[PDB]
């Protein structure tokens, strides 16, 4: 986890969430995944959502809610919530 | 003579429940052709009546087969198989053996059936600015009562009118407005109901 | 594969409508019915054990997942088979 | 398909003539005998009369209360059924219907609200309802004709609202009593469209 070293603690966590999203969706090209698209139009189903939240809770060491995919429908919203959940 | 054709009123029917409305007939309506000559009409509140069942048992097109029908030489029975929320209104026992049909029948008050409630007798003295305006209208309001089989007395009657709404949906009760239009002097000379929701009259005055 | 999205029970029991629900109690089996119209097995003398008044098929539509069930699509399959059989919510005594 | 849309509503005094037309579309007009039905507000129907088909010829039979007053005609080439009102009076204030048969009223027109009243178009005498100690209401005494909507809290409160039906006085006017039932300082507004008499009211016990 980034120790609030710079305001980039925001963009680095955003990129980390995007990387785990591109590794959970089967995107071999982890380059770009629609950020404005919801977690229901990108094929993020029960399996994808669960293992994505496990990846985020392991890399960032957090405890995401079970309904996190529904709480934050967008990768932008999920990244904002995770970066805001520091303390 | 005119055949007497009247259909029992106060018909409480609840959604998902089978009911049965019968009719009376003095002179036989089973004509020599072997077919009864009565009709079954439904006046939908706020819409036009509809042809349900003709010749005693034959049903019309457009209306679903839920309206089943039969009867004897004099006694008839419309077997409404089932009532849903749209099946509310006035059913008519119009016969068809003697034109003129000037009387369609008092009609049957088909109502969403529910247990008996307590009528809220609310006496309301008229406003004083009405009393200086030239009239006087004391209203004995009845709200949330079913069935509607009560009239409001005016003691200490004859100047009372009637005003009742039809049933609502989620509460399925009735509301009554007994308006006692009055004059100037007689204001300083009580209302009670006899609804089956209670037994003893409840006397409250202005 | 049913185990891969974690939709199964580690004991094989379909704990239906129970606090101990874990998922499917996946089993294997069969079942097969001989059907005929009610006024076709009575004139032929064939035994009549039960009658299917009405049936309906209704997709879940745009649910929250392929395997995810729809809460407002089952109501329409229970009511379509209900408005096709001529029966109602107060007529069915028990529901499998 | 079949339609029997009507036309010819209005507001008249006792003693003048009114028009009622029954538009026929979708069928052969000369086959069925056109009939006319009158519906008193909120209570029992009363039948007016019918004309027999010109193939039958026959006569025009009317109700006992409209002898020498109403006449009914029919035509195929232009396909309109007529109910002619002459020497109208108070009872004629009702919604008339056009029925598709002398004995079998299988179809039913939507209904024209024919009103024969002696009143004139003026604003209502909105008179409140001081609660005894409960429900709060307000009357709509003395208005004419009958378009009306009475809301509470200016269309904000909708639970417990009971828009009571029109009340027919002998003076030709109307009275409405919209009352809400909720423990408490409420607003009731009545809008008479023809006259633009928009009355707002505050009520206290």
- DSSP per-residue letters across B2-22: PPP------EEE-TT----EE
What class does CATH assign to D127-203? mainly beta
Residues of D with CB under 8 A from a CB of B: 37, 39, 44-47, 61, 63-65, 97, 102-111, 125, 127-132, 134-135, 137, 139, 141, 162-169, 175, 177, 179, 181
End position of a domain, from candidates B67, B87, B113? B113
**What is the C-alpha to C-alpha distance for residues A19 and B22, in angstroms, rounded to an integer?**
75
Give residues preceding each break in chain A, C–N over 2.5 A. none
B61, B122: one domain:
no
CA distance A58 to D129: 68
User: Do B122 and B43 have their domain in common?
Assistant: no
Which of B58, B87, B113 is a domain's end point?
A: B113
Considering the domain architecture, whether residues B87 and B128 belong to the same structural domain is answered as: no
B121, two tokens: 């007798």
Q: What is the CATH number of the domain that holds B2?
A: 2.60.40.10
Nearest by CB to residue C5, choosing from A40, A46, A70, is A46
**Are B89 and B147 contained in the same domain?**
no
Under an 8 A CB cutoff, do C65 and A50 touch?
no
Closest to B156 (Cα-Cα) out of B187, B110, B197, B120: B187
Which strands form B21-23's sheet, in the order they lie side by side?
B21-23, B76-80, B67-71
Q: What is the 3-state secondary structure (H, E, C) of chain C?
A: CCCCCCCECCCCCCCCCCCCCCCECCCCCCCCCCCCCHHHHCCCCCCCCCCCCCCCCCCCCCCCCCCCCCCCCHHHHHHHHHHHCCCCCCCCCCCC
Geometric angle at alpha carbon B41, from D31 and B53, rounded to 5°:
75
Residue C28's contacts (CB-CB under 8 Å, 6 or more residues apart) are none
End-to-end CA distance of chain A: 12
Count of domains observed in chain B: 2
Give the C-alpha separation, B5 to B94, whole Å.
7
Q: Which two tokens stand for residue D19?
A: 């028009």
- Is the minimum CB–CB distance between B99 and chain D shorter than 8 Å? yes
For residue B17, the chain C residues in CB contact (below 8 A) are 90
Whether B54 and B5 share a structural domain: yes
Cross-chain residue pair A46–C4, CB shorter than 8 Å:
no
| SS3 call for A24 | helix
Residue of D47, D127, D179 lying closest to B104 (CB–CB): D47
Q: Is the domain of B17 the same as that of B97?
A: yes
For residue A69, give the chain C residue with the closest CA: C64
Same domain, B181 and B126: yes
DSSP element (H, E) containing A53: helix A46-59
Q: How far apart are CA B57 and CA B40, in angstroms?
A: 9
- Same domain? For B134 and B159 the reply is yes
Residue C14 C-alpha, separation from nearest chain B C-alpha, in angstroms:
33
**Which experimental method was this entry solved with?**
cryo-EM
Residue D35, H or E segment: strand D34-39
Token digits for B35?
């077919």
Q: Are C and A touching by the rule of 3+ CB pairs within 8 Å? A: yes
Give the torsion through C-alpha atoms of A30, A34, A37, A42, to 10 deg: -40
Domain closes at, from B50, B82, B113: B113
Collapse the DSSP code of B50 into the 3-class scheme (helix H, G, I; strand E, B; otherwise coil) and give the result.
strand
Distance CA(B82)–CA(B96), nearest Å, equals: 26
Q: Is D13 within 8 Å of D30 (Cβ atoms)? A: no
The pairing of beta strand D10-12 with beta strand D34-39: unpaired
Q: Is B71 helix (H, G, I), strand (E, B) or coil?
A: strand
Structure tokens at B84: 């849903």
CA distance linking residue B111 with residue B19, whole number of Å: 12
Residues B96 and B124 in one domain: no
What does the CA dihedral C21, C26, C29, C32 come to, rounded to 10 degrees? Answer: 60
User: For the packed helices A9-24 and A75-84, what is the interaxial angle rounded to 10 degrees?
Assistant: 130
Start and end residues for every CATH 2.60.40.10 domain found in chain D: 3-116, 127-203
B107 and B34 belong to one structural domain: yes
- Please indicate whether, in this complex, the C-beta atoms of A45 and C66 are within 8 angstroms of each other: yes
- This structure's resolution (Å) is 4.1
Q: Which residues contact B106 (CB under 8 A, 6 or more apart)?
A: B6, B7, B9, D44
Is the CB of residue C6 less than 8 Å away from at least one CB of chain A?
yes
Asked if A63 and A26 touch (Cβ cutoff 8 Å), the reply is no
Question: What is the side-by-side strand order in the sheet with B174-182?
Answer: B120-124, B136-145, B174-182
Q: How far apart are the first and last CA of chain B?
A: 50
B25 in the same domain as B96: yes
Answer yes or no: do C65 and A46 touch at CB < 8 A.
Answer: yes
Nearest to A10 by CA among A87, A86, A80: A80
Which CATH code, of 2.30.40.10, 3.90.1580.10, 2.60.40.10, 3.40.47.10, is assigned to D3-116?
2.60.40.10
What is the helix (H) or strand (E) element at residue B42, kind and residue range?
A: strand B40-43
In the numeric block, which tokens belong to residue B136?
């006087």
Residue C13: exposed, middle, or buried by beta-carbon count in 10 A (0-12, 13-18, 19+)? middle
Determine, for residues A47 and C5 on separate chains, whether the beta-carbon distance falls below 8 Å: yes
Q: Residue ranges of the alpha helices (H) in B20-80?
A: none
Cα dist from B189 to B10, B155, B182, B186, whole Å: 37, 10, 12, 6
Helices (H), chain B: 128-131
Q: Do D162 and B54 touch (CB under 8 A)?
A: no
Judge if B98 and B138 occupy the same domain: no
User: Is D46 in Cβ contact with B103 (below 8 Å)?
Assistant: yes
Q: Which residues of C touch B82 (CB under 8 A)?
A: 88
Range of the domain at B124: 114-206
């Amino acid at each position: 986890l980034a120790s609030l070293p710079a305001p980039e603690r925001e963009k680095a966590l955003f990129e980390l969430v995007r990387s785990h999203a591109a590794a959970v969706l089967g995107h071999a090209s982890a380059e770009r995944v629609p950020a404005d698209q919801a977690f229901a139009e990108l094929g993020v189903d029960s399996l994808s959502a669960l293992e994505l939240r496990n990846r985020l809770g392991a890399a960032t060491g957090v405890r995401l809610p079970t309904t996190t995919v529904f709480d934050h429908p967008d990768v932008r919203t999920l990244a904002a919530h995770l970066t805001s959940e520091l303390g | 003579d005119v055949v007497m054709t009247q259909s029992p009123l106060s018909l409480p029917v609840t959604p998902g429940e089978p009911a049965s409305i019968s009719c009376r007939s003095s002179q036989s309506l089973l004509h020599s052709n072997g077919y009864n000559y009565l009709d079954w009409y439904l006046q939908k509140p706020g819409q036009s009546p509809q042809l349900l069942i003709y010749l005693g048992s034959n049903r019309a097109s457009g209306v679903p087969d839920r309206f089943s029908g039969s009867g004897s030489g004099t006694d008839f029975t419309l077997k409404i198989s089932r009532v849903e929320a749209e099946d509310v209104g006035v059913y008519y026992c119009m016969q068809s053996l003697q034109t003129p049909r000037l009387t369609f029948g008092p009609g049957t008050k088909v109502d969403i059936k529910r247990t008996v409630a307590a009528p809220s007798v609310f006496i309301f003295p008229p406003s004083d600015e009405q009393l200086k305006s030239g009239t006087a209208s004391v209203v004995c309001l009845l709200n949330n009562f079913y069935p509607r089989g009560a009239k409001v007395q005016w003691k200490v009657s004859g100047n009372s009118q009637e005003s009742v709404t039809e049933q609502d949906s989620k509460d399925s009760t009735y509301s009554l407005s007994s308006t006692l239009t009055l004059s100037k002097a007689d204001y300083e000379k009580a209302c009670e109901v006899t609804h089956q929701g209670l037994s003893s009259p409840v006397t409250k005055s202005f | 594969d049913f185990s891969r999205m974690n939709s199964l029970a580690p004991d094989g029991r379909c704990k239906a409508f129970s606090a101990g629900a874990n998922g499917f109690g996946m089993a294997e089996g069969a079942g097969m019915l001989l059907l005929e119209r009610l006024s076709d097995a009575r004139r032929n003398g064939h035994p009549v054990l039960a009658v299917l008044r009405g049936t309906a098929v209704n997709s879940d539509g745009a649910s929250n997942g392929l395997s995810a069930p729809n809460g407002r699509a089952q109501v329409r399959v229970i009511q379509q088979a209900l408005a096709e059989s001529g029966l109602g919510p107060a007529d069915i005594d028990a529901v499998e | 398909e079949v339609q029997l849309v009507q036309s010819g509503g209005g507001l008249v005094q006792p003693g003048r003539s009114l028009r009622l037309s029954c538009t026929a579309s979708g069928f052969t007009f000369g086959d069925y005998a056109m009939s006319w039905v009158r519906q008193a507000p909120g209570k029992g129907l009363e039948w007016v009369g019918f004309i027999r088909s010109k193939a039958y010829g026959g006569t025009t039979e009317y109700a006992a209360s409209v002898k020498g007053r109403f006449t009914i005609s029919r035509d195929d080439s232009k396909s309109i059924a007529y109910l002619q009102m002459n020497s109208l009076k108070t009872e004629d204030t009702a919604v008339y219907y056009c029925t598709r048969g002398g004995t079998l009223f299988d179809y039913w027109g939507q209904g024209t609200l024919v009103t024969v009243s002696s009143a004139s178009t003026k604003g209502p005498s909105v008179f409140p309802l001081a609660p005894s100690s409960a429900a709060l209401g307000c009357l709509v005494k003395d208005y004419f004709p009958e378009p009306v909507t009475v809301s509470w809290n200016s269309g904000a409160l909708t639970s417990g609202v009971h828009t009571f039906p029109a009340v027919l006085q002998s003076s030709g006017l109307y009275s409405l009593s919209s009352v809400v039932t909720v423990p408490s300082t409420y607003i009731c507004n009545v809008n008479h469209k023809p006259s633009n008499t928009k009355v707002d009211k505050k009520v206290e016990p």
